[PDB]
Amino acid sequence: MSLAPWRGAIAHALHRNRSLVYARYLQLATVQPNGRPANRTLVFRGFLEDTNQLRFITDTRSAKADQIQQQPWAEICWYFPNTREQFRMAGDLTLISSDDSHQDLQPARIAMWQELSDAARLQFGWPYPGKPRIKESGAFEPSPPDPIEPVPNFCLLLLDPVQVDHLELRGEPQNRWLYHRNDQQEWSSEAINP
Amino acid sequence: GMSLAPWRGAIAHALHRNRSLVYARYLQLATVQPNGRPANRTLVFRGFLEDTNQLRFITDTRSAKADQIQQQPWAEICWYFPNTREQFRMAGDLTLISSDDSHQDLQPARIAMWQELSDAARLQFGWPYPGKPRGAFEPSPPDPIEPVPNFCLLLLDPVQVDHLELRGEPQNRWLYHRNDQQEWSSEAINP
Numbered sequence: 001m002s003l004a005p006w007r008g009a010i011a012h013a014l015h016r017n018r019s020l021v022y023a024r025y026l027q028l029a030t031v032q033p034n035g036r037p038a039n040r041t042l043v044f045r046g047f048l049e050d051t052n053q054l055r056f057i058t059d060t061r062s063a064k065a066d067q068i069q070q071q072p073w074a075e076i077c078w079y080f081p082n083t084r085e086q087f088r089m090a091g092d093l094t095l096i097s098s099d100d101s102h103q104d105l106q107p108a109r110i111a112m113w114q115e116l117s118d119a120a121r122l123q124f125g126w127p128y129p130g131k132p133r134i135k136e137s138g139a140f141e142p143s144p145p146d147p148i149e150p151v152p153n154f155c156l157l158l159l160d161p162v163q164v165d166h167l168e169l170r171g172e173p174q175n176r177w178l179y180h181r182n183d184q185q186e187w188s189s190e191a192i193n194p
Numbered sequence: 195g196m197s198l199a200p201w202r203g204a205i206a207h208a209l210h211r212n213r214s215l216v217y218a219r220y221l222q223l224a225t226v227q228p229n230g231r232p233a234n235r236t237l238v239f240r241g242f243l244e245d246t247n248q249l250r251f252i253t254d255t256r257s258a259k260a261d262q263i264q265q266q267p268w269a270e271i272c273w274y275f276p277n278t279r280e281q282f283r284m285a286g287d288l289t290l291i292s293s294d295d296s297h298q299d300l301q302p303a304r305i306a307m308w309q310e311l312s313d314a315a316r317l318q319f320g321w322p323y324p325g326k327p328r329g330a331f332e333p334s335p336p337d338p339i340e341p342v343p344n345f346c347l348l349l350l351d352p353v354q355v356d357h358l359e360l361r362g363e364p365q366n367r368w369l370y371h372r373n374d375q376q377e378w379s380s381e382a383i384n385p
């Protein structure tokens with residue numbers, strides 16, 4: 001509810017990297033049921049209003065959906081190329097799908113769906129991810145879905161950071177700060193050796 | 195394997211076609227911690243190890259990832275190339291080569307990596323202990339010939355590779371997998 005102390009740093013990184021579309025791309029690591037890590041790029045879609053949670057979208061049919069359901073803890077690594085800074089953020093994921101697990105967050109899911117472009121919504125109508133490639137281009141050109149009402153395989157994914165490591169390569173010689181949230185939701189920070 | 199893996203051409207093309215971006219050689223390495231939680235951080239890609247398909251990186255023995263990898267030497271990299279809009283995910287086992295006696299056959303490779311670094315890259319290995327509370331950052335330059343004990347060469351040997359091209363019809367995705375005979379298969383898959 002109060003802004004986390006690293007929010008200004010993130011805002012300054014986003015602003016100074018705004019010329020690069022890809023500065024909003026970050027890597028989300030999860031753990032598989034078999035204990036091995038998984039890592040893939042997602043698009044950052046802003047913070048959820050009145051919170052410090054980061055928003056992403058994903059398909060319920062993707063592998064990460066089941067990984068997250070079994071172990072919701074993730075760590076993102078986010079590198080900003082124009083300013084040579086990295087944020088690592090670890091915390092719990094919430095996956096809001098069409099199931100009834102998070103009814104209180106359906107409005108957030110619906111809002112996200114509606115805020116997307118047509119192109120972004122259209123991808124949720126593509127064939128089943130990871131299966132043998134459908135060779136006909138038609139399967140990838142479905143009619144747009146309802147732009148008001150999310151499709152059942154659309155998920156809003158939230159990350160609630162409880163630990164953030166910010167590394168600035170343009171320092172004296174480099175600066176590194178660790179932020180941690182305790183059980184009372186209070187943040188602490190400390191400068192640490194790179 | 196000693197034969198080039200079938201994804202090596204694709205990596206070569208990506209590296210070439212993104213050569214104007216220094217940061218196209220930065221990638222993110224995910225590991226698992228002893229408590230079961232993931233960890234993810236950027237590293238610099240420093241080429242393939244000669245006569246292999248293994249990727250080279252460097253790291254400090256004092257870093258948290260070093261203990262993580264010693265306990266669970268399976269990692270997944272995610273590598274995004276911004277000008278060609280393509281992603282490689284690569285999973286497999288890591289080898290950490292330090293000054294200890296565990297990989298004597300790879301000491302020559304560790305020494306060569308050290309020698310190939312810039313002076314600036316070597317100097318970091320003389321910095322204070324990573325992660326502890328902050329002239330310490332301007333130590334005498336390390337010997338450029340002989341690696342310091344906290345220098346590690348880190349190798350990743352991929353067993354599975356997922357290559358996604360966002361500039362396709364509409365996107366292309368290929369999965370490559372290595373079997374226990376060290377043979378690679380590939381398959382076009384839905385994005």
Ligand SMILES: Cc1cc2nc3c(=O)[nH]c(=O)nc-3n(C[C@H](O)[C@H](O)[C@H](O)COP(=O)(O)O)c2cc1C
Pocket residue numbers: 025038040041042043044056057058059062063064065274279280281358360
């Ligand atoms: C730049 C870029 C942006 C991406 N954005 C997303 C995204 O926001 N959500 C998503 O689920 N996948 C996104 N992907 C695709 C994922 O990286 C991955 O291929 C897909 O989600 C399947 O991952 P999974 O098998 O681990 O579930 C993006 C890929 C690239 C390279």
Ligand SMILES: Cc1cc2nc3c(=O)[nH]c(=O)nc-3n(C[C@H](O)[C@H](O)[C@H](O)COP(=O)(O)O)c2cc1C
Pocket residue numbers: 079084085086167169220233235236237238239251252253254257258259260
């Ligand atoms: C662009 C960039 C390149 C980096 N290159 C390396 C590197 O090659 N090796 C390394 O150990 N850390 C590298 N780092 C620092 C790591 O991201 C991380 O802060 C450090 O290794 C500590 O990680 P750990 O605490 O998980 O061990 C790099 C960071 C950035 C942003």
